[PDB]
Every structure is written in C-alpha cells, then in structure tokens.
Amino acid sequence: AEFDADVIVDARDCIMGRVASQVAEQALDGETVAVVNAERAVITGREEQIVEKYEKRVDIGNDNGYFYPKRPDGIFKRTIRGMLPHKKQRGREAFESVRVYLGNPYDEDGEVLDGTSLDRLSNIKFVTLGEISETLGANKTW
C-alpha cells in the first residue's frame, strides 16, 4: 500500500460530487490526494431514484463491456475519473496520483474540504455510498 499523499480528504458526510470536483482540480494541479472513508461520503436526493440510476449502470453492458464498480471504493474513484481527462497523459497521471480508501488507513485524520459538508440536522433526503453499495449487492468489506 503506502500512498504518500500530499492531501488526505475526509469524505465522511460530504457531497461526493462536490468533493470529487475539488480532488480532480487538485490532482491536475500536481497534488497527490487520498480520499478517506468513502463508505461514508454521501449523495443527496431520493434513495429509491438514486439507486435506480446506479442499478441501471450495473445492468448495462455487453461483450465490449461496461464495467461499473459497486463498492464505495470504485463508485467514488469512478466519479472522480468522470471529472478527469483520463484517456490523456496529463489526465491519467492526475487520476493515478489519486486513491480512495474505505475507512482511514492513515494516522492523520483527513481534512474536510470547504463547501463539501452536508449537515445531517438539516437534511433527510440523501444516501450513503455504503448504502448504495450494499443495495447493489457488494460484499460489505468495510
């Protein structure tokens, strides 16, 4: 393992998309980012509708293949890839200098990026990456 990250982000209770946006922005700036506690990051809206979207992505496919992740590990890292020009040298470099983890394998407590936090006391319609993964059938390793 061992990922000498310049930045350790804490996705716990944070809008996944909004975190992913800033992380990509930084990887392209040369920063090595480690996103932690993916299982606990969140995405707002109706759980039923949200899950239909992620279930559809799992059903899609064919011989050429449309591999779509089910664990918060991949759901997140994929989300980030969608915000990167990964088929290009510069974009693949950034993406590769970014890793997402379940829980926190580091000693430091990651930092919370501004604007990315969700206030549980003011919101009820949102879901946890971990919950999507379980509904999608993933083996709850975390």
């Binding site: 064919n62 590990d73 379940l102 394998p105 083996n139 390793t141 975390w142």
Partner: protein
C-alpha cells in the same frame, strides 16, 4: 409465427475454456455448525459397478425393498494436512495471513512443492492468535495433499495439493483443532470427515473432448431434411441478425468441450470401507484393481478414471441424512462385456 424455444445450452458454465487446474477448487464451503472439523477430502476415480440396497426412504412405497443402484468407486487413501493457513479480514476481502507447518513430510512431496527445511511453527501460531485477539481473523484452512503412491492404478507419485477450509464451533476451539491435526504429521482419513449415507458435493475436471462443434458442444440441432444435403450438416443457421453488426458471445460456437471444472451437488455416499470388495473381475477397464481405502458414491462423478476428485459436505442438501444404508450386494462382474 415461429414457436418459442429455450436457448441451446447454459450460459452459466463459461467461458467454456480448458481448466486451469486439473485439481478441483471448491468455491464454497459448508456452514459452521457442529464441532470443528476439516470440510473436505479427496480421492481418485476408478470406475463404476452397481449395488443392491435396501430402500430406506421413510416416504417411499418401496421402503425396505431391494433396489439396484449405480455406483462410482473412488479410491480414497489417507491424505496429509501439512499446514494451517489463516486468513485475515481486510478492506479487500480475505487475504492469506500466515501458515503453520509440520516437520514430517511424505517422502515424495518434494515432487511438487519445495518442502520446508527451516520453519517457525510458533512465531506463526503466535501471529495467528494475536490476529484472533484483534478480531481480524477470517476462516482457517488446511493445506492438504494426496498420496497417489498408495494408489497403484494411478501412475503418478507427485501429490496433488489443495486447500481445505476448517469449520466448526468457535474460532478458538477450531484453531486448536486445526493445529492439532497439522502438528501430528497431518494424516487423516475419509472416515474422519464422512459417514456413509451422508450427502457430499463432488467436484472434478470433466473428461476432455478437444474441439467439438455447436451440435455436441451446445446441443444445437443438425440441419434437417433437404437442408442436411445441400452442404451444411451441422452448422448453425446464422451467427446473428444484421443489427447488431457483430457476433454476440451467446451464439453457440465450436471450441473446447470437456476438461472443465464441475461441482456436482448432493451425491449420496453409499459406503465407506477399505479392501477389495468393490473391485471388478478382470479389473476396472483402463485403471486397475482396487484393494484399499475406497468410497462408493451414488451415481456419476465428473472426469475420467484416475482423475483426482474432491469431496465436500453437501452445502445445499435437499434430503435429511439416512446413515449407513444396507448394502446387500456389490457386483464384482467383469466390466468387459
């Protein structure tokens, strides 16, 4: 309007390629319930004969009557459990943590792996127990190997090695059970795991048949009537519609047929014993004579004679066990004829 019809063959046993390991690799084990105990065993296929049995199904009209039953004779000499490998639960599933070995090894295990000359059975056992304390211990499995030297009908001497999970009571009592089995020398028998009349799943690499076409390999029809005479006897109608302009992997095509791994559910163990009671006059065709530890499995077992097969306590039995069936007769009639 073209009648409906199920597709030819199952899409669940592919890709239909050659097996990677001639030795079967179970992908599931029984539930932890009874006392601790190794969850599997192994032997070599010899052939078939039939047997006369006293029906023992409490719900059968024939309960108590003679009933002939086909049987596959499996030579099952004692194996050696040479190590205790422990797994730890991590964010990426289970991973091998460490192994605990013995000193006494079969004289010819040196034909497959590099037998240990300097090992530390306690440094390892300690690491395992520390792990168990932390609560990071995933199941415990025993590295297991056969002794084909005890089987004269099998040309090989080079053992077949396979991991077999240990299941049972508490992980602690279980770990101790495992460690004792290994420490000894490892040796254990079919008796130790199975009792006649129980249901076992048998895994094995089926007989190889090289390349074969769609008809034999997928069960597609042969061209019929006039269509069978114009130049196409056993070639499917079409590889697919115009659009999508590509051949889907689901259309039955020629290729490797046979030599695949198959796990055959619920096989009734008719009788465990040892000696030459089930041998056949003239010898089992293309095998030899049986006279040692053996098992009679009801029905068929994947693979040709001499192939290593694996036993495992049935994981999804449909019937309750009726232990020790009464075997009134065991054919010894030559198989040649």
């Amino acid at each position: 309007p073209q009648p409906s019809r199920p597709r030819k063959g199952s899409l669940g046993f592919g890709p239909r390629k050659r097996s990677t390991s001639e030795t079967p690799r179970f992908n599931s084990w029984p539930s932890d319930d009874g006392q601790p105990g190794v969850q599997g065993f192994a032997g070599y296929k010899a052939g078939m004969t039939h047997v006369v049995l006293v029906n023992d199904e409490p719900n059968s009209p024939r309960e108590g009557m003679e009933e002939t039953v086909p049987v596959t004779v499996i030579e099952t000499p004692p194996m050696r459990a040479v190590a205790l490998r422990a797994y730890e639960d991590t964010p990426y599933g289970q991973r091998p943590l460490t192994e605990v070995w013995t000193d006494e090894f079969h004289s010819e295990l040196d034909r497959t792996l590099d037998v240990p000359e300097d090992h530390d059975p306690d440094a390892a056992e300690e690491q395992i127990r520390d792990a168990h304390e932390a609560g990071d211990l995933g199941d415990l499995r025993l590295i297991t190997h056969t002794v084909p030297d005890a089987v004269p009908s099998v040309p090989k001497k080079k053992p077949d090695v396979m991991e077999t999970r240990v299941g049972g009571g508490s992980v602690s009592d279980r770990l101790d059970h495992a460690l004792d089995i290994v420490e000894d020398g490892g040796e254990h028998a079919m008796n130790d795991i199975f009792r006649a009349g129980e249901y076992a799943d048998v895994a094995g690499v089926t007989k190889g048949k090289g390349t074969q076409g769609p008809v034999k390999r997928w069960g597609v029809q042969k061209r019929k009537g006039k269509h069978a005479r114009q130049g196409w006897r056993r070639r499917i109608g079409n590889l697919g519609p115009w659009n999508p302009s590509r051949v889907r992997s689901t259309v039955p095509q020629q290729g490797q047929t046979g030599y695949h791994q198959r796990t055959e559910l619920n096989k009734r163990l008719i009788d465990i014993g040892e000696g030459d009671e089930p041998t056949v006059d003239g010898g089992f065709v293309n095998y030899g004579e049986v006279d040692g530890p053996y098992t009679l499995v009801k029905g068929s077992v994947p693979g040709p004679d001499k192939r290593l097969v694996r036993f495992r306590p049935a994981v999804r039995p449909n019937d309750q066990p009726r232990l020790d069936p009464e075997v009134r007769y065991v054919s010894n009639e030559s198989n040649q004829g």
